[PDB]
Design a protein around this ligand. Sequence first.
Ligand SMILES: [Mg+2]
Ligand SMILES: [Mg+2]
Ligand SMILES: [Zn+2]
Length: 710
Amino acid sequence: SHFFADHDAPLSMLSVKTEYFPQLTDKEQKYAHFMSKASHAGSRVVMRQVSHESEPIFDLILAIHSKLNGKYPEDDITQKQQTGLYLEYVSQFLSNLGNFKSFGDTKFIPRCEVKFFKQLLELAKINPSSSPLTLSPVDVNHEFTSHHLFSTINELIDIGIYHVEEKAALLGFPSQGYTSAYYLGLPVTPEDMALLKEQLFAELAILPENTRINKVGENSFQIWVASENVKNQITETYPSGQITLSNAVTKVEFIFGDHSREMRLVASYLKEAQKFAANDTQKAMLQEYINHFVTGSSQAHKEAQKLWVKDISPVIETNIGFIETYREPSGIIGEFESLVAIQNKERTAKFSSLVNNAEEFISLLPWSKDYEKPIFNPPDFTSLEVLTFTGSGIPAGINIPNYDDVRLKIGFKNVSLGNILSAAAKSSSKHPPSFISQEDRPIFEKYQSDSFEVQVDIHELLGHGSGKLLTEFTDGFNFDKENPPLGLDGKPVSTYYKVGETWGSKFGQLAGPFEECRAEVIAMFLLTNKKILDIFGFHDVESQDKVIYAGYLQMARAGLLALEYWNPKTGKWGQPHMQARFSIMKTFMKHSTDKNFLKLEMNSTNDDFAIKLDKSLIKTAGHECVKDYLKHLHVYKCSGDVEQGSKYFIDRSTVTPDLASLRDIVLSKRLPRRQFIQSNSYIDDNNKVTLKEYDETPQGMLQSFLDREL
Ligand SMILES: [Mg+2]
Ligand SMILES: [Mg+2]
Ligand SMILES: [Zn+2]
């Protein structure tokens, strides 16, 4: 593996300005605005938590750009190449808010020559011997930053930016030769963090998520608390000054005011958004967040979360703070992150319409009422559009809070991030989607997104929502035990779920991919339904057939891309959704009534191919092989036929020699980790919230952050 930044990384502008944002009321826009400002105010916080050089590098990047007036070297074509490489590093750095990638926790360095990097200083007239401290905003409290670890800017470039050591290039315990920005001073050991967890935090009932550890001695620690306050204003919970643990040796002192500058900014913006909250619960929630970032009380954040869980299906969903605790070695301290996601209000309405008509579509599904619930119970499913996500990496969904006591007692939120999931399937880059023929590029590029959304909604509502397991209870069955439902062969099934037995227990690990497949096939099945399309806003036959075509084409492609997550050595799948999609693509190709429904045209060098899917066969062969696959999956699952069901699905998901031969090709067409650019909001002369977007380029990413500094 290499330690270089990505080249030709795909950049996605998280656009919500044209379609989604305009749907929000004025109040909702203002709320979204200030929560976004609060989110971005924590950018530097994340950096300080990724690596010690991260913030300094950020400052240097800003300094260079400023002193060069945004004009980078472009004389010789070599200078152009070196500039591009430099900007690609900057872009990836900004995408991860630091120089250790969130996906892998490994340090990455620029591809441009170090000599060139230092030439940027020459051009910008930045004295390489000066201290990085001179590059920081004057109101950043350097007592809690890492600039001092680098005597000169030259050292920052050499050691911070470029230097690589196998161990040091990985997040972990500094005592073991690794890197961690959660720890400062002397090398922090696992024993240290084990002791602090039990004999300090647990002992004093103090949640550790918003802290950093400064080891000032072999047995002396400082606990830096993230807060605007520079003093302890919560002595009822936090000890004042130095204390000694139970071992009468270890000394610990809580020091407040870490990230004070940013905490103050975050709190000020939360206060603004509070004026525009949608209900009293959101207002109270914000107050606790404010108490949390101002005072440093970690309990206040938990109090915010308890209120948050009680805020049902808001139009503007948010969550902020030191949330996930996996990047810190001992796994108890959280990395800052902040989310602002908005409803697609039109989509929410369409989904409601789908629910209101659910029973009708359920009946249309290819099985007897014997394998269906008498009354439809709509599953819980939330899809939102990311407007802002400040953090080391933007997830495809969120499942929080992480406080086990709150999750159990009050509940938790599970939210899917639409425009993030959509990007993974869209496969947007600096030119055509892999394996899509030129002939299909137009329609695919135009309808892929729409078909994807339609399929997701059906998948989640009617897909997972449908079905009844033939089950035994302590005193009776939910089916006619004497004359059980008929199987696919027309004979009464002899299988069922005995008392205590569940889908998961009976089908074991196969249950995951199997059910995801069933849900996916249900979506494909109903994709061609006239009223379904009407509900989703496709009323004319021409656009309908295009959505359908794009849906089948996208599924075929997805099943082939899935080969990446199949291990040719062990034959085991790495992701349930991938195995399911593959089985469906394989169904099109090998189990249709017409062999020419799905074909793969290899190029002359057998290192690339084009998907040939016959649109005119979708109505017949296409629909029938999907309906066929669905009937088997559903009856097998519901009748508890683990024996037939397993063999059936395992076979359909088995990578045949011909398809296995394509894996290398699939791997070669893999796009690098996607980098997301976030909009910037502001209030105009007319007191109107306005969104500013940016080009999907390294310069665009850079600009999006420049516009956030001042
Ligand atoms: Mg039916
Ligand atoms: Mg049978
Ligand atoms: Zn699913």
